[PDB]
């Protein structure tokens, strides 16, 4: 029966109250924009890649990081969750924001979902780079599929000390308390040497990709697989934005893997927020885009060149809104905005939820939701908007269940 199994590269998932993939975030998989030669994801991973092989200083010697750019995103919520120490009843697992295959497997929300399995293959260090997945808002600067780079770089006692003359005595680990500076299990002098190494390598990653007049910050933050954690914010166009995360990992994680002799970093870097900081790239849909006239911009002869994408004319937009009386007690902002992606795809820039209101006579609640249709690549005419937006009234009636107000 339809709706009853999804299969996925030659695997069968049975479907459940969890279940909410769409055909369209699906048709996506495999497509791996960061494998693909010339891409500007591809650009930056081969780049990040290179400071690693060429620019990263090891005590003992280089560690060596060995990359994962081909992993399926197919994952367990025990991968993508429990793994890293998520609570069972934290916000990142619901529904609203991820791509659930069943209650057991998911579309990858993040690299991180890897960790555990690599640190239990008995890596010290890797790169993880792929596609991964969120249930999100329509605008120039969010897309259902994205693109990270994980990082992580596990350090033993005397390689962490090994430049220090009497150091003998210091250590990883000792039995203290947790504070907003370090986990209960950590020396303090391991924390500030894992920090700075951390620090110093993305701050020297950052200045070779944008040079020296980048304003970078690091903000101090929370993750529940890693403490202490920042965030990297580089000021672009008048305003912070938050680049990466990162911080000492959970030594309840590394030793659970196996790695009790060791303490570590990690990072995850959203590609695409880099690139359209570093390239000029002024909307997300580019990247998704086959036009010639985006890909050939970025066919360079060394990886390391300073490409400014020059964007095309914007081309006209039109806007409708739409409203409609949700379903009783049962529904959410992203199963309409998935809707759209799956009716009207990259001719949608923007989808903005405008107005709420319940009627007191039926105890109804309205949304109304404003439509920004505008392509990047060409003039869209009113009629195909007109009947764009039209099978999307019909679609949410069918779908979501809503009742139409217009
Ligand atoms: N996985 C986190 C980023 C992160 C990776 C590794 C360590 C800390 C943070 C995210 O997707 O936001």
Known sequence: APGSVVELLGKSYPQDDHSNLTRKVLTRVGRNLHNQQHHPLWLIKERVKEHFYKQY?????????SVYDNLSPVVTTWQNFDSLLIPADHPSRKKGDNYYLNRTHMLRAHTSAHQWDLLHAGLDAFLVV????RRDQIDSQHYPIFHQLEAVRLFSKHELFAGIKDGESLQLFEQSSRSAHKQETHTMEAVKLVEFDLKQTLTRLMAHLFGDELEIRWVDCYFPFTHPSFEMEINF???????????????????????????????????????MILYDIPDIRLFWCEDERFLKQFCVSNINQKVKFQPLSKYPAVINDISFWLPSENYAENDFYDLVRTIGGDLVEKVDLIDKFVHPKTHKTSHCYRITY?????????????????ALQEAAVQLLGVEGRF
């Open 57 to 65: 200083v090891g005590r003992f010697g280089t560690p060596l990081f």
């Open 130 to 133: 792929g596609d991964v997945y």
């Open 237 to 275: 166009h008048g305003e912070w934005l938050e680049v990466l995360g990162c911080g000492v990992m959970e030594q309840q994680l590394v030793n659970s893997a196996g790695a009790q002799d060791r303490i570590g970093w990690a990072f995850g870097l959203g590609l695409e927020r880099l690139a």
């Open 374 to 390: 505008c392509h990047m690549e060409r003039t869209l005419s009113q009629r195909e908007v007109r009947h764009i937006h039209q």
